Design a binder for this molecule. Structure first.
Ligand SMILES: Cc1cc2nc3c(=O)[nH]c(=O)nc-3n(C[C@H](O)[C@H](O)[C@H](O)COP(=O)(O)OP(=O)(O)OC[C@H]3O[C@@H](n4cnc5c(N)ncnc54)[C@H](O)[C@@H]3O)c2cc1C
Ligand SMILES: Cc1cc2nc3c(=O)[nH]c(=O)nc-3n(C[C@H](O)[C@H](O)[C@H](O)COP(=O)(O)OP(=O)(O)OC[C@H]3O[C@@H](n4cnc5c(N)ncnc54)[C@H](O)[C@@H]3O)c2cc1C
Ligand SMILES: [Fe+3]
Ligand SMILES: [Fe+3]
Lengths: 446, 447
């Protein structure tokens, strides 16, 4: 009967309990991730309301799962029987853009693009652009440490989180991190909150640092995954850093070309003036010493090839359920990793489509399961399970940006090992003594 | 005995007990920071030996304080009576330079420059260049989260720690962080170890990210001023008028004519600037002639000696007596107000405080030199730097920007963090160090 206490705690129009308005709030876009009907879905208005839902929930042992827009692919925001889904959709204001400090102060509910458009008016820029930029929230991007296409040279969300206001413990509002451009005082707790996937506390206000408002595409029509890619084991080994570098295959494109060589490799270079034309002709030398049917300098605003890469996951989702994996391996092991994905596609008769942020060795293998073809659905799980077990042996990690959540919990336990898992339970026990903040995700308590 | 177990595990040429050969291992350069003779100073050879020192001391409640080169300015490496000083001076090798991944894998004892010179051979660059680059270690810079001079565009040491190998708890050797260029698996535990000042475990290996060695545009900008008050509106204007510089420092003549009594190589405020792009290179002048300036030459030649003077400013003064240094960092828009307040606090406590500052990001270094014979001047200066810390907190800054909390800034940091954050600090250290052996009583005070 936690709902009666919540409505007496934070009004009656903040707490929603209708089970029909909850099926959309109890899961993200991760399919086969066990979710259930929660007890209540709270829509807090300010930090005080979150400080009450955490306080009510800490005295009862009721689980609290934060939720932004529910666009995760690992089930990180999925609810359980009796949980409380704190929806930050009402805290969606940008509270400041310090133009001289080059920082912005945002609430966890502001959408990624809504933030980028706002800071653009003041000549500042927020680099991290995850392929879900028009939908994901800053509160979600901070807890998952989401990365984008420009992470090659600009970094992930952690590279811009300066400080934050969180609700931790039994409901204490604390200020974490610095607000300046330098500061070592204490521990790096504001950083520990990044990538924690909401299992240590709810962020109710985030800072973030900005950069001034910083164009050459590269293109390359190639064939197999064994080759083609190998220009990524060469661009990093030979030619500088491309402002972007993706790896999408024709298999995903002719599913975007229906919804309004063989495997391409786009690259970018954003340098003003003559410094900048050479990055676009420096990023070519790697592309023709490797088969190369076409490969044209290009750079003709076309750009149409990068919207296709962004709409790679917005496609193949209305064509059936989509299972996605997200491994990140060393850049020198991308050629074999593409070999293992295509070889795992025949060991389990499943034709795995490949998209990848090739600029840092982060691959997104993806297979589309026919809502009627069963065995390809069950070989793919085993096929996507050998991919993670292979990416771990080459020296990579089970996830590169999407987070652990639920679907990558086992494989992640193998990477961290028994000793690191012991520290995870110890850390969460200190900052979440009641065990209410998204329990059983990333690691399993017990 | 307690030394008997150290000698029984790996104690032949690793364990030293001579009290004369331990004072150089039991304290750093922080003046008036309580240090004392430890019980033993271990100089481990590999990660396994550290796992033995932690295992012995965890079962006995004996404190362990890590040591790199002992160049801290906050007493972060100071030992206590009966502690064990783990000296990483024997782990001073770079064990890898991944050229395709653009990473380096180094041991905690490697000197900061020793790392950059090594990676320079392969056309790669390690940006963070702290003013103690010829002496401090990478293991120390990771534990302190040290920053450099051209950091105002590339970031601090934390911005380059990818993964690490640490000895945590009762002695388990663990791998923290990734080695690739992406990875969110688990918590950012390797990051929690960065900037922890060795109070959660000893780092025995850190992986670091590198950047290509671009050259060409080393446009510098000099320009002596008249006062510290009017070298405000010109540091807050280089950012508001557009685009931050590759570097921007602010040193005064008292430190310059303290370097000139050595390598005999103008005004009262130098303020150097940099630009690595090229336009703008005449635009960072406009902040200097719109405000008062005795001089200002966009000089691209060598001009470059003045930066060795800025770097060697604390390597200077080091010969003029004991030096009390502070390290506050305030918002960039509040540097002008801070420089007025410190110089005004120099007469409210008539101690003439010399000023160096990373004015490009708001990190100020007020410093006073103690005559060492005037006793009250020890207490006149102490309170003068105390109102400076209390002013940086009320203005919206932090008690430390790069030097770390350590010992000398514990009272000020406790006021900034507050009771709730301090409670989380003890809870974390209690969880990862249940025995309380990893540098106890630093950064925060255990109840
Ligand atoms: C088409 C498409 C493309 C995508 N491309 C990318 C990509 O390139 N890179 C990438 O990283 N991701 C991508 N994503 C998914 C991405 O991981 C999520 O969108 C993002 O990580 C967070 O989104 P959210 O906030 O909407 O998620 P949610 O599922 O709502 O939750 C995010 C997590 O944070 C927690 N949480 C939310 N708010 C708070 C708070 N204040 N405090 C603490 N915890 C909180 C939740 O517990 C949850 O674990 C993509 C998704 C889609 C559909
Ligand atoms: C002239 C001068 C200029 C300086 N400039 C800067 C600057 O620009 N920026 C800046 O940040 N600092 C600067 N410093 C001080 C600087 O913090 C230290 O030089 C450096 O951060 C620590 O290096 P170290 O190994 O010498 O530290 P130590 O004196 O050994 O102590 C460092 C701290 O980290 C711990 N530690 C050491 N090794 C390890 C390990 N392997 N694992 C865990 N903990 C460990 C110690 O316990 C101690 O608490 C300067 C100092 C001087 C004298
Ligand atoms: Fe992605
Ligand atoms: Fe400094």
């Amino acid at each position: 009967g936690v709902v009666e206490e919540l409505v007496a705690a934070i009004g009656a129009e903040q707490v929603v309990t209708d089970p029909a308005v909850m099926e959309g709030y109890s899961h993200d876009e991760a399919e086969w991730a066990p979710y259930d009907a929660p007890a209540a879905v709270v829509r807090p208005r300010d930090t005080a309301d979150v400080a009450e839902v955490v306080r009510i929930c800490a005295g009862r042992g009721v689980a609290v799962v934060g939720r932004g827009a529910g666009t995760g692919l690992s089930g990180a925001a999925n609810a359980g029987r009796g949980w409380v889904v704190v929806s930050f959709e009402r805290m969606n204001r940008v509270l400041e853009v310090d133009t001289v400090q080059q920082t912005v102060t945002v609430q966890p509910g502001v959408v990624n693009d809504d933030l980028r458009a706002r800071v653009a008016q003041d000549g500042l820029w927020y680099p991290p652009d995850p392929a879900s930029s028009p939908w994901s929230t800053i509160g979600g991007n901070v807890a998952t440490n989401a990365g984008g296409l420009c992470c090659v040279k600009y970094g992930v969300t952690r590279d811009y989180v300066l400080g934050m206001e969180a609700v931790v413990g039994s409901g204490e509002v604390v200020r974490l991190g610095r607000t300046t451009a330098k500061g070592v005082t204490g521990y790096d707790l504001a950083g520990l909150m990044v990538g924690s996937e909401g299992t240590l506390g709810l962020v109710t206000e985030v800072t973030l640092r900005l950069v001034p408002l910083r164009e050459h595409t590269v293109v390359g029509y190639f064939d197999s995954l064994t080759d083609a890619g190998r220009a990524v084991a060469a661009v990093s080994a030979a030619g500088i850093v491309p402002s972007a570098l993706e790896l999408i295959d024709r298999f995903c494109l002719q599913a975007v070309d229906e919804w309004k060589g063989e495997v391409l490799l786009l690259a970018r270079s954003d340098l003003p003036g003559t410094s900048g034309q050479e990055e676009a002709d420096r990023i070519l030398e790697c592309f023709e010493k490797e088969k190369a049917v076409y490969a044209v300098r290009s750079t003709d605003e076309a750009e149409a090839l990068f919207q296709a890469r962004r709409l790679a996951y917005p496609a193949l989702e209305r064509l059936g359920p989509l299972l996605t994996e997200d491994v990140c391996v060393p850049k020198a092991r991308v050629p074999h990793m593409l070999e293992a994905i295509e070889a795992a596609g025949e060991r389990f008769d499943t034709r795995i489509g490949n998209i990848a942020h090739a600029g840092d060795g982060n691959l997104h293998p993806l297979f589309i399961v026919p809502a009627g073809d069963e065995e390809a659905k069950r070989r793919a799980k085993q096929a996507f399970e050998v991919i993670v077990d292979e990416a771990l042996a080459v020296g990579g990690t089970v996830t590169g940006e999407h987070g652990v959540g639920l679907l990558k919990m086992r494989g992640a336990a193998d990477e961290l090992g028994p000793h690191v898992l012991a520290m995870h339970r110890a850390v969460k026990g200190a900052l979440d003594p009641a065990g209410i903040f998204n329990p059983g995700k990333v690691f399993a308590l017990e």
